[PDB]
Structure formats: C-alpha cells, structure tokens
Design a protein around this nucleic acid. Structure first.
Length: 1089
DNA sequence: TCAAAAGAAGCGGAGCTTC
C-alpha cells in the first residue's frame, strides 16, 4: 500500500533489515478515507497550481460544484504568482539537500551504508530517492510540503497565540518584573523556533495526508515532518519570506547566556487580494479544511478534545455548549465598517492608538509601549477588513451574510472563539461583526424598547449601569447626549446623512469622549445618531447590545464555591456585593448599589488595605526612617496613579481600582511579589509617559521650567509645580537607594548602594534592573503586604484555606504523575537499548507512551464534575525526552522533542478549578440550559445581549450562575485525590519529587528529618482536609437553597433570578441570617449523622 | 498567575561545551 505509492524511496521498510532502513514507510500508512488530495500526485505544485488556475478547474479538483465567490480574477492572479513562488521555495530546498549531501561526503557515506537517515539532521534522507551518484527529493512529498509551507506563510501569524509577561519571562529566562520595556512586544510580534516549526510541522504532516503508525518510533513519526519544517523555515529565511533574529539576552542582562531565535513572517500588503481569500490552498488540498470562514449554514464541526489536551475528551454537555455557540449567526454591521473605512486606518490609530509617533521625540521607553498599542489596533484593523473583503464577495448586501465561528473548550473550561482577532477577542472587530440584533420601536421614549436602547447606549458610554436603576441612568445618559457628546453626535448625524467626516473628526471624537473613549463607545455614538436620522423610528434595526456583566465574578465565584465553614455575617455582606442577596425578594444589583451598599468587593479590599496600612504604620510609629519610606512610596504613587490621593493634611484615600487586578490574580493564585511588580510597572509606565510630556513641553518653549514642564498640569502654580518636582526626585531617591528587608519577622531598612542619582534626561531616562528591584521591594512590604491581608480579610480566611488545601492536593498529585511517567519512560528506554533495531535517537512509540499513560489511571490524573473534565498536570514539556528531535540541513534550528506528559502543577490547581467550575461551568450551562438565550456573544464572565431580549437572557444568566454555584470543586478534587492516595507509593519516587511533596504536606521543619512514611502520613492528612471542606461546601449549598435568594451577579439589566427558597429570611440583619443558616447547617449535619 | 511550549551552534553523527 504505502510502498506502492512511494516505491523509489531509499531503504528497506523493515526495522529488522541490515542496510538502510526507510523510516518514512515504517512510520506512516495510507488512511482508510482520503485526507489530502495530493497523495498519489506526481507533482502537487503543478496540479494544485492548475487547480487554482480557474474557478472551473478548482471546483473539479475539489470535486465540488461551487467555489467560494471570493475566488475571482484578482485572487486567481495572486495565487498564480504565489505558485511560481512555491517553485522558488522548492528550488531553494533541492539546492540545500545537494549541499548537505556533498559536505563531509554524507551522500557517499549514506550510499555505502552509513545510517545518516537516523541522525538528528538527516531524517529527511528518508524521503529522497537514488539518482545516479547522489540522491534527490521525492517530488510528491517535497512539493506537497511546500504547499503546506505556502499556506502557513499566508496565515500562520494570524493564528499565533498571544504572549503575555509570563510567557516572555519563561522564554527569555528573565524575571517577569525585570523585563525591559518593549521586550514583551518584540517577542509577541515574532515566533520562537519551537512555535514556528511546530505549526509548520503540523501543517506539513497534515497535507501529507497519511496516518502515524502506532508502533513506529516518535523520533520518525514526529521527526520526519519536523525536519521538513526546519528546512522549509530555513528556506523562507533565504527567500526573505521570514526574518530570523537571534536575540542576545546577555545585553538585556549580562548574566543570561541564552541567545534566542525569533521568527517574523514578512506581512503582505493590507490591500493584497490574497487576503480576501487566504485559504484557497488549504481548501483544495484538505478534504476537511481546518482553516476557512464559515458562511451561511456551513457550520463548524465540534471539537472532540480539549484544546491542546488530547488526553481529555470534551464531555457531552461541553460538546452541546460548543454546538450551540457555533450555530450562532454573526453579521457585519455596515455602518460601523463604513465608519472605520471613512475614518481610515491612520486616523483610527490616532484615535485609538498612539497615531503617528514620527515625532520620535518622546521618552524612549514610552515610545515602545505606544508602538505596541498601535500594532494591536493596526493588525486588528487589517484583519477586520480582510474578513469583510471575503464577506463582500458572498453577496450584494454584506449585512445579510451569516457568519459562524469555531470554538473549543480550554484547559480551564472556557469556550474560546478560535483565532487571534475575532468578536470575542478584538474590541474593534466586536463592534463590526455582531450576533445581536433587534427591531425596536423608539417612536416613543416611554417605550420599554427605548429604555433598553438607553441602557445599551449608557453602558457603551461608560456609565456604571449596574450601580443605578434604569430611571436614574436614563437621566444620566440624557445629560450626556445633550452635554459633552452633542458635538460628536451632530457629526455622526452628518456622517449617517452624506457619508462624510470632518477633517477634525479625531479631535471632535476624542474631545467629546474623554476617558469614555473605546470602540463600543463609537458604536453608541453611531447607533444613537442612526436613530436620529432614521425614517421609521418605530422599527429601528440595531446590533447595539447590553452586556450582562459579572460583578467581581472570579472572586465572588471562589467565595461561593469554596468557602467551607459555618456562615458569617461579614461573608453575607461581602457576598451581597457580588449579587447574592438573602431575604430580599427580587432585589437587583442596581438597587443594592444605590440603596444598601455602594462599595463593591474591590473597594472593600481597598478599604481593608487602608486599615491594614495604617496598622503597619503604628507598629513602627517611632521609626522615623520607615515612616518616611512608606510616605515616599505613597507620594510617588499619588504623583502618577489616579487611584491614590494624598491630600493636603495627609488624608489618604484610595479608589477600588488599585485592587482590581491584584484581587483578581490573587484568586488565580498569584504571589505577592508578582503583584508588586505589576504596580511598579504602572508607576514607571506613567513616569516614562510624563517624560514625553516634558520633551513636548520645552519643544513648545525652550525655556519652560523643568518643574513646570513635568507638573505644569497637575500643579496650580509655579512654586507648586516645584513641590511636585521635589517629591519626585526625592521619592526616586529613597526608593531606589534604600529597601525594606524582613529580618526576624521584622522590617529593617537597608541601603542598596545603587540609588538613583544624576541629571535626568527625559528621552534616554530608564529605571533599570537594580532600581526596578528596589521599587519592587518597597512596593512589596509597604503596599502589597497590607493589601494581601486586606484581600484575605475580604474574601475570607475560610476561602484561603480551601485554596491552600486545593493547591497542595493538586500539586502533590501532579508531582507523582510527573515523576512516575518520567521513570517509566526511563524503564522502557532501558529495554529498547537492548534491541538491535532501536537506536539512541529514536524515542518510544505512541503505543508505548499510551501504555505508560494508562499505567497512571489509578492515580486519577483526571478531575470530573459530571459535566466537565480537568487534567491539571497535562502539558507538553521537552524534559521527558531531553533530546533534539531534528535540525535543518545546516545543523541549526535544533528543535527539542516535546512529548505530551504530566508536569508539576504549581498553583495551577486554583485557576483551573475556580475558573472551570465558576464562569466556565456557568457559560456552559447558559448555552445548554432549557430556554438558552439565543444570538448572544459570551466572553467568559459577561454576555452581550440584543436589546430585544436583555430581560430574559439576563435572568437566565443569573440562573446559570445559580446552578454553577451548586458546584463543589473541592469535592471533585477530593474524589480524585482519594483514589490517588490509595494507589500511590511514595517510596518509588526520586528524592527530587519526594522533596517537593514534603513542601506541600509538611511544615518546613519536618522536611529534613522526614521519611517516606512521614510525607505519606501528611499527604494522607490532606485527604481528610479536603474531605472536610467538601462536606462543608455541600451543606452550605443545600442550606442556602432552602432560603429565599435573589441572584443578580450578571448585572446591568436588573433581572435577578429567584430560587424560590421557602424559608424566609427578610427583615433580618446579616447576623440573624447567619444564626438561622447555621441552625439549618447544624441540623443538616445531624441528618447525615 | 490561566489561556500552549520555548537558546544557539561546532563537531560529529550524541551530547558536551562555550558564549
């Protein structure tokens, strides 16, 4: 079969033969059902080029009757030029093989018997054929691989993952808090070797259309395609389709020896016809294209497995979730597209980005951040227009072309729309392609329709819609439309009348919006002005939406899901700030915020921080030098952060804002040091920006006061702008030269001998490493520490205990799985080494890996809820194989061998379960529950709803929130950890893993003098802890369900979900409610007893 | 801290080494 297709390859397809053995045929086999239309073709480049030569030829080749209408003349012409370029890549490749065969007589040595086809750099020799006194590529495999390479070149960038700080830190080996400025931007805008080759390899093997033989070594099944990828990547470097950049980390940190390769794909012109249809190749080659747009009733198929987690199948309920979301039709809203278009890319960059930095006369570091904001917008813009260019071809009226999007479930159970730039992920696109729409009767402003319309406009305009009633927001929206926004409204009216914009459109918009500016705000100004000129106001069609938005969702979900003790009154008040109201029939978040408590969970945190902060000062009341450090750190923040306000007499006031991100990531398991670095970065980002202001201040006057140029705004006078300049230089002084150190459980100031000193240069200015670290330590001990205590005091110690036990449990388990998998890989390799057909370079077969994985089932690597499946340890590390998989023909581009294997979890257990059983389970529920809202856009912790169904959809959302609150993540972990605890043997563990386990289950002291039996007893103690917590959470949930509850967590609209609790707890203080709930609690315990 | 990983290259044909 396979030999009949490739009968001329070099070698014998028998692992037991003595001479050259051909590992291509030994590792692959023809599939049952055709996957690629090139297998069997003696020249895929020519055949595919012919197939692309005309719509008629295309249709026949793909055995389809009609072809994408986007496949017209211009596109056809661009694809002809691209095919000719494919021949260029092919020629480069053929020439590289020849050079490889000549150097060090590899070719001659290979023909004489040297098994060079097994070297990390010669696996491609498995696809060559004998030709005279040398070898040559098999044209079918080569060309097909080139076709794969062309598709990848056209759409790889758009499919890349977004790299945050964590990623960059892991890649570069530089602490996340110390990354220079545009470093993250530089690495997010390029691909690492692994990222490039991996996606390229996947594409190549896919186009080859064969199947992996389960009994073939991974070194070949994965190696041959990866080796082909490396060569194609090298070829693209030679052709300049791809730019390679070797980043030397020794400059950005003299101690780092890592030199990292970065790969960027030369972008095509935004107006290139290929963009209107960049999947023509993919769609001709693959019978089941996994890269295309979905129009009409061409619905996306349902992913069978969790994203990048083949070991986990999407449960039946999750599959139903995906199906519902993928069936939703999205539509282009022409007015917005025409607006973006009339404004133009350049002006949207000015308006929503940094618009033209050409005046490269602004702080060097600030300039790198501004450049990043521009990129995100620009790429976002071109991607939106490439999409409408294809849509446009589908029909005469682009507003009526239905659009479907593929989705998939992630590790933490979220339904992520696939693709970097889409409605779910890109704000710019979100306002252009919507699933929402409604026909409203706005003829009377007393109608409910108008009231929904106002809600939509107000929320888009940044009015805190969930903090007031419809009525009150109705007045606030009006005062704004007729106020600061009127000039922008009038302009939009003209735009929706003649199609033109003034020359000062950016200024009119920027001035009318102020900090309310955003893409959704542009939609609001657009929709209101459309309504104004509308002929028939009684039937206004708009995609404008209202989002049922979760209030402090993550922290509230955690409190609700993992608090496991008796009920507390602080807890009852605090949980009310998240939508759970006890004894208040039909109460809404709007009434709660305006009538009972105007402070949300972020504020409560900030207020607890302020108290814990004042407390810190007392413990050092006399220590003048410490008081001054705190005061200086507080002074620096007040100088640049809006959330801090030191006032005249010293009154310290804080906004809920400074606790937003920290409260959130502390729920995702973040450490204190990490939070501190985030805050520092905020400060520095603002300083760098103020440095640009100064530059721009003296360019506007060469004599402006240094102080006046930097604080002319914040100040009210001269000597005043001098007081601020005095605080700055002094704050940067004490903060970079002196840092707090915790000794004997007490704080002590220590000099760094690396303080900031010298004449400030507003353009070169930069807060370096040793100075960033200093700010970091001050921020850590004088702000974050008290903030962390405040957070804990707010969410509850009980919840913190649960997350600790959860982390510990999931960690310990991840360790064993990891150590065991690694060991059993070492045992098998130990056998293979005794086999004459095997070689040190080959790894194990997929079968041998599937067996090793199976040998771990009894350790319960999976966590089940009944509707969701989690595999916390799952990952793709290079640690298991610990070896190169393949290199290019120049002995470079050495790609490490990655294997799907369990790894240490760290704190990952927390985010996985809180997100998974929290917002993950909720949205899943919301899209599959009886009467599931239709035509919405779900973004994890919020849902966009068309103006016509905001009431019922919001209520269903709150109901979904309620059923997700019936979850018990700890219980699920208990179930898994308990099975694990009865099959694990801590003596089979290396001292390495045995030590990590001790860290989680044993208190620092007992670690050294700890036997296997010691950590086994402790680990066993953790089982009981979880068992107890799970039992508590379960009682609370049942008890809480017997009382009358009103839930409005997905606030905005004011449609709370009523649980019909029979027991009435109205007319009671939280204290009374706690005692009553505990009576039902103790009572329920007895029941079980 | 979750969402996905992750250094390059001589000599020799793996994996130690130096930057």
């Amino acid at each position: 079969g396979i030999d009949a297709v490739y009968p001329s390859l070099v070698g014998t397809a028998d692992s037991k033969a003595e001479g050259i053995k051909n590992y291509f045929k030994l590792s692959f086999t023809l599939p049952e059902e055709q996957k690629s239309r090139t297998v069997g073709s003696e020249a895929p480049l020519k055949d595919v080029a012919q197939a692309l030569s005309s719509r008629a030829r295309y249709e026949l080749f793909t055995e389809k009757e009609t072809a994408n209408p986007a496949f017209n003349g211009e596109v056809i012409k661009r694809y002809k030029e691209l095919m000719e370029h494919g021949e260029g890549i092919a020629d480069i490749l053929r020439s590289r093989l020849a050079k490889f065969l000549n150097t060090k007589d590899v070719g001659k040595r290979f023909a004489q018997g040297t098994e060079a086809n097994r070297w990390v750099g010669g696996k491609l020799l498995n696809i060559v054929e004998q030709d005279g006194d040398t070898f040559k590529y098999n044209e079918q495999l080569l060309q097909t691989a080139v076709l794969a390479g062309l598709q990848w070149r056209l759409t790889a960038t758009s499919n890349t993952a977004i790299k945050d700080a964590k990623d960059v830190a892991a890649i570069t080996g530089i602490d996340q808090a110390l990354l220079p400025e545009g470093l993250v931007e530089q690495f997010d805008t390029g691909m690492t070797l692994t990222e490039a080759v991996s996606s390229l390899a996947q594409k190549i093997e896919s186009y080859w259309g064969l199947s992996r033989n389960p009994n073939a070594p991974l070194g070949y099944t994965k190696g041959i395609p990866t080796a082909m990828a490396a060569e194609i990547l090298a070829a693209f470097v030679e052709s300049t389709d791809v730019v390679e950049n070797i980043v030397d980390m020794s400059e950005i940190d003299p101690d780092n020896k890592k030199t990292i390769g970065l790969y960027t794909i030369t972008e095509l012109d935004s107006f290139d016809p290929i963009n209107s249809f960049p999947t023509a190749i993919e769609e001709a080659v693959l019978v089941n294209p996994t890269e295309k747009m979905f129009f009409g009733d061409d619905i996306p198929p349902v992913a069978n497995t969790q994203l990048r987690n083949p070991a986990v199948r999407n449960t039946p309920e999750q599959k139903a979730a995906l199906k519902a979301e993928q069936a939703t039709e999205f539509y282009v809203h022409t007015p917005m597209v025409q607006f973006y278009e009339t404004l133009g890319k350049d002006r949207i960059l000015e308006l929503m980005g940094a618009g033209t930095l050409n005046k490269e006369l602004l702080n060097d570091n600030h300039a790198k951040s501004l450049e990043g904001k521009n990129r995100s917008v620009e790429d976002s813009y071109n991607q939106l227009f490439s999409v409408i260019e294809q849509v446009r071809a589908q029909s005469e009226d682009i507003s009526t072309v239905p659009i479907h999007y593929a989705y998939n479930m992630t590790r933490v159970g979220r339904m992520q729309m696939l693709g970097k730039y889409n409605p779910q992920s890109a704000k710019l696109v979100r306002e252009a392609i919507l699933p929402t729409k409604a026909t409203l009767d706005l003829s009377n402003q007393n109608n409910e329709d108008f009231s929904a319309f106002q809600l939509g406009l107000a929320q888009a305009l940044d009015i805190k819609v969930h903090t007031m009633t419809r009525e009150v927001m109705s007045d606030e929206l009006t005062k704004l439309l007729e106020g600061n926004l009127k000039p922008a409204i009038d302009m939009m009216v003209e735009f929706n009348t003649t199609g033109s914009l003034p020359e000062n459109a950016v200024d009119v918009l920027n001035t009318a919006l102020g900090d309310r500016k955003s893409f959704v705000a542009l939609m609001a100004l657009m929709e209101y002005s459309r309504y104004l000129v509308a002929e028939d106001k009684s039937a206004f069609v708009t995609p404008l939406y209202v989002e049922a938005d979760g209030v402090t969702n993550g922290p509230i979900n955690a409190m609700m899901l993992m608090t496991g003790g008796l009920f507390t009154p602080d807890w009852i008040r605090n949980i009310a700030k998240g939508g759970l109201f006890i004894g208040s029939p039909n109460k809404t978040m709007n009434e709660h915020r305006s009538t009972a408590d105007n402070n949300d969970l972020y504020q409560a945190s900030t207020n607890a921080l302020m108290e814990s902060l004042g407390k810190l000062r007392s413990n050092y009341a006399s220590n003048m030098p410490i008081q001054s450090q705190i005061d200086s750190l507080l002074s620096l923040m007040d100088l640049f952060l809006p959330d801090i306000n030191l006032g005249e007499n010293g009154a310290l006031e804080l906004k809920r804002g400074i606790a937003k991100n920290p409260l959130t990531i502390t729920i995702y398991g973040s450490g204190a040091r990490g939070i501190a670095g985030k805050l520092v970065s905020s400060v520095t980002d603002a300083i760098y920006e103020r440095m640009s202001d100064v530059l721009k201040a003296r360019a506007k006057d060469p004599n402006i006061s240094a102080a006046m140029a930097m604080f002319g705004k914040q100040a009210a006078s001269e000597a005043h702008a001098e007081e601020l300049l005095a605080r700055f230089l002094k704050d940067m002084e004490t903060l970079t030269s002196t840092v707090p150190v915790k000794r004997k459980g007490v704080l002590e100031l220590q000099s760094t001998g690396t303080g900031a000193k010298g004449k400030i240069n507003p353009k070169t200015y930069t807060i370096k490493g040793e100075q960033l670290k200093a700010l970091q330590e001050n921020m850590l001990h004088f702000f974050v520490e008290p903030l962390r205590n405040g957070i804990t005091q707010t969410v509850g110690e009980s919840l913190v205990y649960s997350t600790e036990q959860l982390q510990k449990a999931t960690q310990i388990q991840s360790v064993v799985l990891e150590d065991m998998f690694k060991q059993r890989v070492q045992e098998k390799l130990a056998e293979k080494a005794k086999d004459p057909t095997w070689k040190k370079g080959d790894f194990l077969t997929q079968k041998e890996l599937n067996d090793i994985q199976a040998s771990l089932n009894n350790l319960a690597p999976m966590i089940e809820t009944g509707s969701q499946t989690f595999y916390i340890a799952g990952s793709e590390n290079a640690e298991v194989a610990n070896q190169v998989l393949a290199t290019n023909l120049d002995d470079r581009m050495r790609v490490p061998m990655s294997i799907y294997a369990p790894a240490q979890a760290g704190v990952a257990g927390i985010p996985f379960m809180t997100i998974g059983t929290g917002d993950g389970m909720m949205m899943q529920t919301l899209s599959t529950m009886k009467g599931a809202p239709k035509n919405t856009l779900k973004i994890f912790d919020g849902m966009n709803i068309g103006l016509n169904d905001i009431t019922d959809a919001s209520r269903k959302a709150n109901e979904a929130v309620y059923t997700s609150w019936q979850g018990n993540p700890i219980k699920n972990v208990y179930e898994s950890y308990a099975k694990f605890m009865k099959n694990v043997d801590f003596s089979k563990l290396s001292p390495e893993a045995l030590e990590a386990i001790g860290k989680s289950a044993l208190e620092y002291d007992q670690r050294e003098n700890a036997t296997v039996d010691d950590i086994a007893n402790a680990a066993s103690l953790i089982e009981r802890n979880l068992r107890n917590i799970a039992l508590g959470v379960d009682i609370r949930h049942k008890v809480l369900d017997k009382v009358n509850l009103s839930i409005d967590q997905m606030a905005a609209v004011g449609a709370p979900y009523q649980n019909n609790g029979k027991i009435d707890l109205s007319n009671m203080t939280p204290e009374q409610q706690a005692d009553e709930l505990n009576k039902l609690f103790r009572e329920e315990l007895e029941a079980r007893k």
